Structure 1
Amino acid sequence: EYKTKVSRNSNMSKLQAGYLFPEIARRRSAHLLKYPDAQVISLGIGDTTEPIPEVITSAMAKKAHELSTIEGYSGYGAEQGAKPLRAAIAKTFYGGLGIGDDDVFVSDGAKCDISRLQVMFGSNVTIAVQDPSYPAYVDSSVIMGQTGQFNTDVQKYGNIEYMRCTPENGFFPDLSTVGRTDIIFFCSPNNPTGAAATREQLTQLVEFAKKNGSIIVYDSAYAMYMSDDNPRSIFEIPGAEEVAMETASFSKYAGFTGVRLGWTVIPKKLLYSDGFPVAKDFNRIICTCFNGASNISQAGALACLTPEGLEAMHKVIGFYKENTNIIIDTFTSLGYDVYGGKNAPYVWVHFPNQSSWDVFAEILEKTHVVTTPGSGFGPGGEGFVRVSAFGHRENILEACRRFKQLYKHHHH
């Protein structure tokens, strides 16, 4: 067969076999061949299941129709995002935090902006991540050339600082043990652990980054599930404006898909070592990778940031939080150590003395419930399984009675 003489990107080659998302899809389909009649319940991926509130879809449909009229029509979009959306985001979520409308960069998605940020930072930065955390940070880092090879003895890529977050340290790293890196990806409430950093912890984090001359990329995607009295934004910490940016996903904030839209806030005081403002480079990257967020999505996002939209968001969030309580009580009554769930829509269940892939396989085999193995979120996730609260109420209740059948004889 013919082959080009183009070398495969050696950073693609670095990636380990059996990435979380394609692996779960494999096992789930293998499972359905095995049990063609199984009623499978998915509590894997943070994948939301309830209809978009009508207030938002009406706004989107209205914008849709308007795009077929003259005066109601508009061509492309402002590349940083429509000014009214950037304004509404700055005021609704960052009012009093010293954030201007022009510090907010709107994108078509949040996972999209991890990527754009990684292209911007480039191949020669080093990164720290929570261990465990969402696998996209690590993966984007490998792909950009920021890492060494995977080491299968420690299950880590070389040159990434994995900051261990455990029950014994209250799921916040011991910073006195963390090596300096250029970038610190920090997600609060964290996926998968559900842990939300306290004000005192985020103060330590900002002080650490200041001393090390690092940039924190703070992912507040799940901040709307906060129940404990903890900061929702890194910019609530004085000094964060010299060392941090913040990224969030509308879909995760609103508790529903359909508004395909994220943002990144980069403050004026965040500077590279030569004094150049980081925001100017991000803006420059948006002028090559982008044209604008979709105007129908923008119309929905704008509808969200109103009394009626905030009320619909709160209600949806409240529904998933009651789903989480059902799951917590199920595992707690079964005798397990259950973490998270308070400030996020998933629970992080400790299964000590089994590999998380084995637990995942056993739960799927025996109950037809899909969960997510902890080791999918890095080596610090080994020992745990994440269970998502995203599903119809009936499905959550049915999954929990199946857990109860499965695990009844495990504990006393």
Structure 2
Amino acid sequence: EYKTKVSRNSNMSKLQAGYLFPEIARRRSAHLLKYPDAQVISLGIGDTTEPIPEVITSAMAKKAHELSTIEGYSGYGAEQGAKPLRAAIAKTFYGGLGIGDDDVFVSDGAKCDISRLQVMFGSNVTIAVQDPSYPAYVDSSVIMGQTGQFNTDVQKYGNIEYMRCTPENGFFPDLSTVGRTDIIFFCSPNNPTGAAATREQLTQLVEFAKKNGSIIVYDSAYAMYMSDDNPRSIFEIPGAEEVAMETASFSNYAGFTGVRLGWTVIPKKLLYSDGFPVAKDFNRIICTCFNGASNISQAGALACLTPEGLEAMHKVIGFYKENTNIIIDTFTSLGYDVYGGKNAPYVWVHFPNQSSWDVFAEILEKTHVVTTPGSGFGPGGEGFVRVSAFGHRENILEACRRFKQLYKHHHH
């Protein structure tokens, strides 16, 4: 066979396996070959399942129809997003926090922004992540050349600061033990643990970033699930404007997982070591490497940020929070240590003295329920399994019945 003379990107070669969620899909498929009649319930990937509220879909359909009219047609949008949408995001989520319309960048989702931010930061920054954490932070870092090779002894890529979050530290890093890095990716409520940082903890985080001269990338994709009285935006912490940016999404709020609409906020006071504003480089990236979020998706997001849209999202979120409570109650009654669930639409179940991949496999094999093994979120996730609360009510209830039957004999 013919081969080119182009060398494979050595950063791609560093990756240990495929992306976590496609790997789970492969195991789900293999399971269906083994059990063709199985009624599989997926509580693995956090994919929303309930319909989008009509007030929001109606706005998207209206935009689509408008595109067939002379007056209503629009072509390229400014890559930063429609001004009324930037304004609505700035006021709804950041009113009172000194965030301007021009600080908001509308995306086709948080996953995509994480990687565009990584292109922006480039190959020479070092990063810290919560351990465990959403795997895209680590994987994007490896792809960009910010890491060394994977070390199989410790299950870590070289040169990443993995900040261990455990039951014993309340799922917040012991910052006095964390080495200095350029970037700190910090998710609150955390995926997969569900832990929401308190005001005191976020204050510590901002102080740590300030002393170390680091940039915090704060992922607030589940913040509207907050039940405890904790900050929902990093910008609630005075000084955050000098060290932090925030990335978020409509995926988990309106069921926009397939529609694609998020945003990133970069404040004016966030500067590189030479005084250059970080937002100006992000603006160059989003103008050069992106051509804007879908106009229909932007119209849907604008409709979300109205009294009727907010009411609708609140109902969607409330439904998933009720699913979460059903799952928490099930595992608690089974005698498990169950974490998260309070501030996030998933639960983090402790399966000590087992491999999380083994637990994943056992649950799938015996109950036909897909979960996510904790080790998929980094070595700090070993010993845990994440169970998503996204599902139709009957599917949640059925999965819990199956869990109760599987684990009935494990505890008194």
Which of the five TM-score ranges fits, normalised by the shorter chain? over 0.9
Q: Which has the higher mean CA deviation after the structures are superposed, 251-260 or 308-317? A: 251-260
Shift of 1:256: 4.3
* Contact preservation (8 Å) 1:44, 1:370: yes
Cα deviations across residues 80-119 of structure 1 (Å, max 9, x unaligned)? 1110000000000000000000000111121110010000
Query: Could you tell me how far apart the structure 1 residues matched to 2:216 and 2:404 are?
Result: 41
Query: Could you tell me how far apart the structure 2 residues matched to 1:169 and 1:375 are?
Result: 19
Query: Could you tell me how far apart the structure 2 residues matched to 1:258 and 1:4 are?
Result: 36
Shift of 1:20: 1.3
Shift of 1:255: 4.4
Query: Could you tell me how far apart the structure 2 residues matched to 1:293 and 1:410 are?
Result: 49
* Contact preservation (8 Å) 1:51, 1:256: no
Identity %: 100
* Contact preservation (8 Å) 1:50, 1:256: no
Shift of 1:243: 0.2
Query: Could you tell me how far apart the structure 2 residues matched to 1:109 and 1:257 are?
Result: 8
Query: Could you tell me how far apart the structure 2 residues matched to 1:303 and 1:58 are?
Result: 9
* Contact preservation (8 Å) 1:52, 1:257: no
Shift of 1:21: 1.6
* Contact preservation (8 Å) 1:259, 1:301: no
* Contact preservation (8 Å) 2:53, 2:254: no
TM-score normalised by the chain length of structure 2: 0.99
* Contact preservation (8 Å) 2:250, 2:261: yes
Q: How does 1:392-407 map to 2 (within 5 A)?
A: 392-407=392-407
* Contact preservation (8 Å) 1:223, 1:253: no
1:323 match: 323
Shift of 1:292: 1.6
* Contact preservation (8 Å) 1:155, 1:379: yes
Query: Could you tell me how far apart the structure 2 residues matched to 1:19 and 1:74 are?
Result: 36
Counterpart secondary structure, 1:263: strand
Query: Could you tell me how far apart the structure 1 residues matched to 2:256 and 2:314 are?
Result: 11
Shift of 1:254: 3.0
Shift of 1:161: 0.0
Shift of 1:260: 1.2
Shift of 1:23: 1.7
RMSD between superposed Cα atoms in Å: 0.8
Counterpart secondary structure, 1:201: helix
Please list every run of 5 or more consecutive structure 2 residues that lacks an aligned counterpart in the other structure.
Answer: none
* Contact preservation (8 Å) 1:259, 1:298: no
Shift of 1:246: 0.3
* Contact preservation (8 Å) 2:52, 2:254: no
Shift of 1:258: 4.6
Cα deviations across residues 58-80 of structure 1 (Å, max 9, x unaligned)? 00001100100001111110111
* Contact preservation (8 Å) 1:258, 1:297: no
* Contact preservation (8 Å) 1:189, 1:220: yes
* Contact preservation (8 Å) 1:324, 1:347: yes
2:79 match: 79
* Contact preservation (8 Å) 1:374, 1:385: yes
Query: Could you tell me how far apart the structure 2 residues matched to 1:27 and 1:282 are?
Result: 38
Q: How does 1:13-412 map to 2 (within 5 A)?
A: 13-412=13-412
Q: Return structure 1 stretches of 4+ with deviation > 2 angstroms.
A: 252-259
Q: Which has the higher mean CA deviation after the structures are superposed, 379-388 or 21-30? A: 21-30
Specify whether residues 258 and 33 from structure 1 end up closer, same or farther in structure 2 by C-alpha distance, changes over 3 A only.
closer
Query: Could you tell me how far apart the structure 2 residues matched to 1:11 and 1:137 are?
Result: 15
Query: Could you tell me how far apart the structure 2 residues matched to 1:405 and 1:205 are?
Result: 42
* Contact preservation (8 Å) 1:148, 1:157: yes
Query: Could you tell me how far apart the structure 2 residues matched to 1:6 and 1:363 are?
Result: 44
Cα deviations across residues 328-373 of structure 1 (Å, max 9, x unaligned)? 0000000000000000000000000110000000000000000000
* Contact preservation (8 Å) 2:51, 2:255: no
Counterpart secondary structure, 1:221: coil
Counterpart secondary structure, 2:329: helix
Specify whether residues 7 and 191 from structure 1 end up closer, same or farther in structure 2 by C-alpha distance, changes over 3 A only.
same
Query: Could you tell me how far apart the structure 2 residues matched to 1:277 and 1:359 are?
Result: 46
Counterpart secondary structure, 1:129: strand
* Contact preservation (8 Å) 2:244, 2:270: yes
Shift of 1:22: 2.4
Cα deviations across residues 175-233 of structure 1 (Å, max 9, x unaligned)? 00000000000000000000000000000000000000000000000000000000000
